UniProtKB/TrEMBL annotation, chain B:
Protein name: ORF25
Annotated source species: Human herpesvirus 8 (HHV-8)
Lineage: Viruses, Duplodnaviria, Heunggongvirae, Peploviricota, Herviviricetes
UniProtKB/TrEMBL annotation, chain D:
Record-level GO cellular component terms: viral capsid
Name this polypeptide is given: ORF26
Pfam short name (any one): Herpes_V23
MF terms (GO), sorted A to Z: structural molecule activity
Keyword annotations of the record: Capsid protein, Host nucleus, Virion
Native source species: Human herpesvirus 8
Automatic annotation (TrEMBL), chain F:
Natural source organism: Human herpesvirus 8 (HHV-8)
Taxonomic classification: Viruses, Duplodnaviria, Heunggongvirae, Peploviricota, Herviviricetes
Protein name: ORF25
Domain of life of the organism encoding this protein: Viruses
Gene that encodes it: ORF25
Length: 49, 36, 49, 300, 49, 49, 50, 49, 49
């Protein structure tokens, strides 16, 4: 269950049902605390957007 | 008042610059944009 | 064999300054209607609600 | 064409647990009271001075440090060690294994200090011979003069608490003293809740100075009054405290101020002799991920 | 993502003309599929590859 | 109801603001901006508050 | 809308692959003889310089 | 590695005799609107406000 | 300069038909990119060189 005003321009493009992107190859090796910062933070806008 | 605006708006590592507030990109090297 | 995962919305709403691009449709355009369904085309090229 | 190689033979073989603790380092610094090539184990540590049965002290190490000859490990065979002699102005390679781990920097200056820290962190106890080997504490000089600095403060206020504990708050003590802030970096030492006693004799000295020393300047001020008396020393009435200038030499008799003014200068030299440094080696180049250094020895 | 349209109209406008297609109307929308496989859509006998 | 009233409004400090009042003025996109965590941690699923 | 419009600049990188043409015999080459210097002699390692 | 610059406006206005050279847009017509954004297609082909 | 469109519309009219492009409306406009490199824009699967 998606908000009513999530705009459609996300949907034509290959992306995620998550609100964020989730590519982990971006992060370093073995940095678990740094790789969680991609998935769950809300100060950092997405590696997508 | 300066403690208000920075809240409402917003180092090195091994000889290569590296910002702490991004643990990863996806769309290549994140460019900059400017104001006139 | 190769799998995939496909991605899909339903039942959204767009912001206030609405717009058109179509030359030929005379149906929907009254702004009181609200869609609650979609349409997908199958393996057999058959539409499904 | 000179040669140097210091082999230390042994009586008993080493255990399989001890040798792995001696492969933990392969290059370090040992004081070594020798010039020969064959040597028994009773000299390569600091147990000749700092051992279990007698209480440990801090002058007699620092006397023995500048007196002695430093050496570098090369190899630990099971039968015997193999040290390398340190020539004055030599050039060789050094790793660290020191506790706690003070991170280096290239192009710095090093002093050689005794371990006043935890005994498990300090030494490697041999049970093959029942004889300790103790390593010196290799710290850069600014850190070494600062790690002594607040611990020496820390030991003095301990004795106030045993006499009257209502004068020093330990939260005020464990915040300003066990913290080292150099190279922008923080460190934290061992508080030692076992009972310390290495740095007690400085606190035996420097506090016995602090009644003798400001008593001492009033006699020296009224000593050689001339018009040859040096013009810079007129200035230092402004530095001497207001209370110091209200002391007579009346009550302390003339046969007693002899016994002051010899004992005055005697501590003021022997404390200079240890604050002025020990034998040293400068390290010019260094890498962090290997921990290997590049040294040149500087005697004293 | 796959084909979708929040009314039967825009599927017909999808298979009508691919070039002068209109992706967003005032009420509804569309997503052209982006996939590593294509197909032959087969409403009636019009074919949009 | 006098004594329910005077004792609340007499000498009042900076008046507090709850979460629900804070969400129900902020516009449709302004929430989805990374200036704010403390309106997005308490948005979990739109049935519960 | 605040009181002004505004203009934006950016940059970009392109990892291009370049074609370098050089005509025949437009540079003369003077090539000396290699010499040896040594530096940083330790007791465990010796480094040279060419 | 060749670099460039890219000149780019946002948030503009046009003079009194406005017009519409247009194939077809039913949407934004009135002079009451004032657009306050732009859109750039990404390197990876996603329009960002 | 590169692409800009003060409403969402004119990106669609850019990629629907390039020859009978609409560059200016009453309140909205577009800038066609002029650069020494030329890409393939790929909203959906319509391709503008």
């Amino acid at each position: 269950p998606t908000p009513v005003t999530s705009d459609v321009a996300y949907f034509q493009t290959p992306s995620n049902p998550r609100g964020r992107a989730a590519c982990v190859v971006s992060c370093d090796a073995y940095s678990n605390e740094s790789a969680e910062r991609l998935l769950y933070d809300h100060s950092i806008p997405d590696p997508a957007y | 008042l300066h403690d208000y605006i920075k809240m409402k708006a917003g180092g090195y590592a091994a000889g290569v610059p590296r910002c702490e507030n991004l643990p990863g990109l996806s769309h290549g090297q994140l460019a900059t944009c400017e104001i006139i | 064999r190769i799998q995939y995962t496909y991605f899909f919305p339903v039942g959204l709403h767009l912001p206030v300054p609405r717009y058109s691009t179509s030359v030929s449709v005379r149906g929907v355009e009254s702004p009181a209607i609200q869609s609650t369904e979609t349409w997908v085309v199958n393996k057999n090229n058959v539409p499904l609600c | 064409a000179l040669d140097k190689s210091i082999v230390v033979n042994l009586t008993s073989r080493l255990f399989a647990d001890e040798l792995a603790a001696l492969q933990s380092k392969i290059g370090s610094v040992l004081p070594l009271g020798d010039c020969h090539r064959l040597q028994n184990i009773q000299a390569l540590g600091l147990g000749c001075v700092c051992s279990r049965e007698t209480s440990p002290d801090y002058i007699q190490i620092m006397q023995y440090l500048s007196k002695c000859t430093l050496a570098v490990l090369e190899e630990v065979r099971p039968d015997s060690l193999r040290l390398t002699r340190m020539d004055p102005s030599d050039n060789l390679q050094i790793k660290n294994v020191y506790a706690p781990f003070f991170q280096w920097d290239s192009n710095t200056q090093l002093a050689v200090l005794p371990p006043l820290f935890s005994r498990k962190d300090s030494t490697i106890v041999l049970e093959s011979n029942g004889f300790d080997i103790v390593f010196p504490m290799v710290v850069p000089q600014q850190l070494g003069h600062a790690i002594l600095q607040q611990l020496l403060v820390y030991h003095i206020y301990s004795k106030i608490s045993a006499g009257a504990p209502g004068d020093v708050n330990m939260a005020e003590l464990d915040l300003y003293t066990t913290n080292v802030s150099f190279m922008g970096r923080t460190y934290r030492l061992d508080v030692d809740n076992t009972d310390l006693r290495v740095l007690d004799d400085l606190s035996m000295y420097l506090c016995i100075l602090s009644a003798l020393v400001p008593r001492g300047c009033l006699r020296l001020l009224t000593a050689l009054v001339r018009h040859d008396r040096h013009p810079l020393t007129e200035v230092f009435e402004g530095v001497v405290p207001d209370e110091v200038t209200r002391i007579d030499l009346d009550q302390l008799s003339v046969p007693d101020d002899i016994t002051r003014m010899r004992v005055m200068f005697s501590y003021l030299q022997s404390l200079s002799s240890i604050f002025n440094l020990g034998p040293r080696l400068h390290v010019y180049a260094y890498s962090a991920e290997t921990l290997a250094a590049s040294c040149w020895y500087s005697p004293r | 993502p796959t084909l979708a349209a929040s009314h039967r109209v825009m599927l017909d406008e999808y298979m009508s003309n691919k070039q002068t297609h209109a992706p967003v109307h005032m009420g509804q929308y569309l997503i052209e599929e982006v996939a590593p496989m294509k197909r032959l859509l087969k409403l009636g006998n019009k074919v949009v590859y | 109801l006098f004594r329910t009233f005077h004792q609340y409004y007499m000498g009042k400090n900076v008046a507090f603001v709850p979460d629900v009042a804070q969400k129900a003025l902020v516009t449709t996109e302004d929430l989805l901006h990374p200036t704010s965590h403390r309106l997005l941690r308490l948005e979990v699923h739109p049935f519960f508050d | 809308h605040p009181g002004f419009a505004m203009t934006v600049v950016r940059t970009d990188e392109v990892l291009a692959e370049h074609i370098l043409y050089c005509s025949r015999a437009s540079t003369s080459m003077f090539v000396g003889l290699p010499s040896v210097v040594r530096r940083e002699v330790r007791s465990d390692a010796v480094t040279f310089e060419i």
